[PDB]
């Protein structure tokens, strides 16, 4: 707090009524400020949960809840569809995966608490976290579950008046809880998955065999909780683990870890590349820290650019602002949401 004026160009703190397990900036941006929006959720103790859209004023600081949609159970994860960001998929504490078009719901929820999702996606037997929309195939959604499977739905092929969709494909390569799943940015047929079986799997949707991946690799010495593909370097990705490390990978040679990022004091739950800078990656978890890494400083640890110490509880999720370089939203288990940007002098050196 004392050093915040020197460590940050922006630090905004907000206490939500209930904690959010998820955070994702919507891509739209609309005075000496602009309005940005976040997809958030609730995590309650036996009370009505909501899918939430919040607004944030950012300089060219007020945070307000714009929309609350009745949701059945806590929102494990919520992700918007790139081709139509009004469409949001959510992971529930039951098996169903839900889809909402927030323009077709009131801004104020009915106190009856009726969850009326636009689609209920069936296929899983248990809850999960991993959720990914295909940026090259509109409406193709991947989901990871504690039932050890990956489901795929094609939302573009659902009947217009249909409210329930069965999984198009179920991928059964893992032998334990599948923690995360992500499509490649460029190859419409490629996606990666990570699981408690300590493996990273690379899948080709053009393959006739849904029980065997294109590549299976022993990624970590503990559960693998997250993955992220580099949006500038098509062959590169990162994984985060209960190992307390982030691993760096090349799709052309997955049997050899390129690098291991070490600083976290506990389990890592989220890893995300910067949307603006190819060598920048961030990671978060149970140690209540969000680390920012710079690949270009490897060997000069030297690759640790910044440690965000604003949270005093486990970090559940974070999201890089797609419109404002170096702005991050991070959320923790103690109801705190932070919107922050490290000092320009830190990344300009």
């Amino acid at each position: 707090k004392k050093n915040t004026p020197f460590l940050y160009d922006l630090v905004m703190t907000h206490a939500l009524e209930w904690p959010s397990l998820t955070a994702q900036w919507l891509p739209d941006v609309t005075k000496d400020f602009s309005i940005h929006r976040l997809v958030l959720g609730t995590h309650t103790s036996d009370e009505q949960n909501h899918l939430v859209i919040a607004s944030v004023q950012l300089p060219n600081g007020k945070i307000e809840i714009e929309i609350k949609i009745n949701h059945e159970g806590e929102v494990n994860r919520a992700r918007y569809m790139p081709q139509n960001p009004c469409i949001i998929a959510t992971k529930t504490p039951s098996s169903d995966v839900l889809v909402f078009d927030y323009t077709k719901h009131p801004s104020k929820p009915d106190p009856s608490g009726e969850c009326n999702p636009d689609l209920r996606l069936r296929g899983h037997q248990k809850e999960g976290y991993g959720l990914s929309w295909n940026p090259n195939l509109s409406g193709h959604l991947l989901s990871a579950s504690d039932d050890h499977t990956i489901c795929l739905w094609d939302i573009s092929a659902v009947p217009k008046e249909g409210k329930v969709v069965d999984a198009k494909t179920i991928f059964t390569g893992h032998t334990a809880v599948v923690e995360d799943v992500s499509w490649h940015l460029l190859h419409e047929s490629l996606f990666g998955s990570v699981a408690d079986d300590q493996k990273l799997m690379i899948w080709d949707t053009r393959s006739n065999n849904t029980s065997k991946p294109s590549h299976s690799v022993d990624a970590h010495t503990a559960e693998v909780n997250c993955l992220s593909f580099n949006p500038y370097s098509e062959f590169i990705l990162a994984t985060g683990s209960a190992d307390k490390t982030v691993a760096l990978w090349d799709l052309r040679n997955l049997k050899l870890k390129l690098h291991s990022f070490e600083s976290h004091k506990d389990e890592i739950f989220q890893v995300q590349w910067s949307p603006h800078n190819e060598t920048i990656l961030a990671s978060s978890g149970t140690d209540r820290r969000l680390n920012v890494w710079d690949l270009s400083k490897i060997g000069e640890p030297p690759e640790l650019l910044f440690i965000h110490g604003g949270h005093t509880a486990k970090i559940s999720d974070f999201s890089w602002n797609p419109n404002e370089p170096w702005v991050i939203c991070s959320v923790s288990e103690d109801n705190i949401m932070q919107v922050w940007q490290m000092a320009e002098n830190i990344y300009n050196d």
């Binding site: 009524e17 209930w18 904690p19 995590h43 309650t44 103690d334 109801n335």
Partner: peptide, 14 residues
């Protein structure tokens, strides 16, 4: 396993 059992309620309604 990934989430707390007793999420706390803060005294606000937004």
């Amino acid at each position: 396993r990934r989430k707390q059992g007793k999420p706390q309620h803060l005294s606000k309604r937004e």
